[PDB]
Homo-oligomer: 196 residues x 4
């Protein structure tokens, strides 16, 4: 038998905002191990540069995200994912014998694509969510041009696993509603309540 569990939390939101129609954006990638790693980037259209490079211990390097430049919707935000993979004399039985480890790490930040033509900010629209219940699931609708990053969500005084609400669209949660979205200062915006 060999078993492992991981314990920890995500703090806040992290995102890259790509302003639609910009030649591109630059993003830092820092290796914080104290050994060399091979960094490989992909997006999930857009294209990332270099698609593959070496990073020495404690060093950082920039990446350039840039858009193929095909049709994007102009009425709303879109969501892509940037994923960055990192890959890595006398005999002495106290040094040499035992268990040795290696690990590969795959990271993904949201890459948020925000058309220049779009009005205001998520905050200004957070109240305007409305809610309903269907085939057992708690459905939320977002009329907003923005993704609504749900950070606190209670239904009938009991809290529901969060998830963003795509703009001009809907999202369906598993089981009176209150919610807070996440503001552009990593923080939680104010609370709202509604009915069904």
């Amino acid at each position: 038998k060999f078993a492992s569990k991981e314990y920890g939390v995500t703090i806040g939101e992290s995102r890259i905002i790509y302003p639609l129609d910009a030649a591109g954006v630059m993003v830092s990638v820092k290796n914080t191990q104290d050994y060399p790693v091979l960094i490989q980037s992909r997006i999930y259209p857009f294209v990332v540069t270099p698609p593959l490079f070496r990073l020495d211990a404690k060093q950082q390097n920039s990446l350039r995200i840039a858009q193929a430049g095909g049709v994007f919707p102009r009425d709303k935000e879109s969501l892509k994912w940037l994923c960055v993979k990192g890959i890595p004399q006398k005999f002495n039985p106290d040094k040499d014998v035992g268990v040795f480890v290696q690990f590969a790490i795959n990271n993904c930040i949201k890459l948020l694509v925000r058309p220049n033509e779009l009005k205001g900010t998520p905050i200004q629209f957070a109240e305007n969510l409305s809610w309903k219940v269907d085939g057992g699931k708690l459905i939320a609708e977002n009329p907003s041009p923005f993704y609504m990053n749900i950070g606190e969500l209670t239904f009938g005084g009991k809290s529901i696993p969060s998830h963003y609400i795509p703009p001009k669209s809907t999202w369906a949660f598993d089981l009176n509603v209150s919610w807070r979205i996440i503001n552009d200062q990593g923080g939680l915006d104010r609370l709202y309540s509604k009915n069904v």
Copy 2:
């Protein structure tokens, strides 16, 4: 002693998230989220790179101890319990949230200590870091590269080279300086903006 396995976000960091605390606001709230599908016990605290760990911070989080169920999230409440802080410049604090087990073979337990920057921003402060990145000046002393920051903001640097050679980035504290180590014998830099992206390149000679 605590056996350290990896560093941030498992050794690979994209950009840098930050939290702004508007000085003498009653308090900010922060989302915290358990990605596992099993319960996690959560311990939160504020630290300062200039204060001893055991000692208390003027700033405080709530709940300082909280069991969080599978996939669940909770809000933390950061509050300045009346410390005294400068009006003219930013102050850096760190909110850390550590997970732990709730109460033939190996059973391994990985405990993630996740810290994010708490940037204490006086409201008597107009503009943003973006508008001050230029103002950095550079100097070499006892073989260390020294950055002077005349501005009220922290310059969270994300790209640094000195004579083509890339240097392990750090921040430069406001109205203060920072000393970088060298390898061999012109300076170029980018700070990290709010879009979580990198700012423009600037260059200057020592």
Copy 3:
């Protein structure tokens, strides 16, 4: 997602021989980590001493295995298992931030109970295994008073996951036979062949 695999082999056999009817035996337990651990022992009758104790980094301590002294068979060897569990100022964001680990470890050596009255050694009896096939499984019989520690086992030129063969008893394997047992020098004894 979080996943881990372990890669390694068992070398040879390890056992404690308890000579039936002895006041007891002594066994070393060494902690090879460089930190303190809490050692807890159990047997799977017999009794182990201390049943629970602290062991500093690199230190060792003895354990006394001793038999309740109830009825044991005298015609053959018996098999018990000894299992030993081991349980365990300025802030600086390069030292303090990241992933930290702990692990508990549970070890089991065979505890082989060998009556004084018993003749010879496994080696002298290794040839005397005989084989058959039934409900799809490859069955081995052991007429020997000893456990036969199978270390190499091929059937129709293809190798089968090993397992000991209890004495005056039988064992059934999943799917001409050849086999080697393990001698009391950790090594592999000679090869034999039979039919069905």
Copy 4:
């Protein structure tokens, strides 16, 4: 560099297995076993605490590289490819067998480097370690506890105390000595016998 996670058998060692190689036997065979239910790649070699790792040993294992399937076992073949070794005393070698992968989240790989003692025993040597445990003598020098071993065998010590204080055990090489570190300022010991058990206690004054 290789990132070390734990030491032997994950930090908790019961007794000590050994392998005896009868000097100038053609070769001994050893069982090796994959407990996982997935394939493992196996790399075997002999080392000497007195030779450099990269350098070749007179002794050799076969196959030096072997993929072993789920739950499978294989025999290794240790052979003295005509080195020159003393007839009068034992020599210690080490057979090491390392496992490796065959060719959102973390994927972790634990690689176990398992070594067992290869005790090269001349046949011109009657008796066993058991019959010589008594012959150890002790001495204190520059604040180290020194064991003299006049015997042809390795005294694989499994219990040592000096003035009630327990000392991290080691072996004492035959017709040679060993130097133990101290903590504070009478000696008691047990070697490890063939039943994998501990021998009788002996005591002596420096």
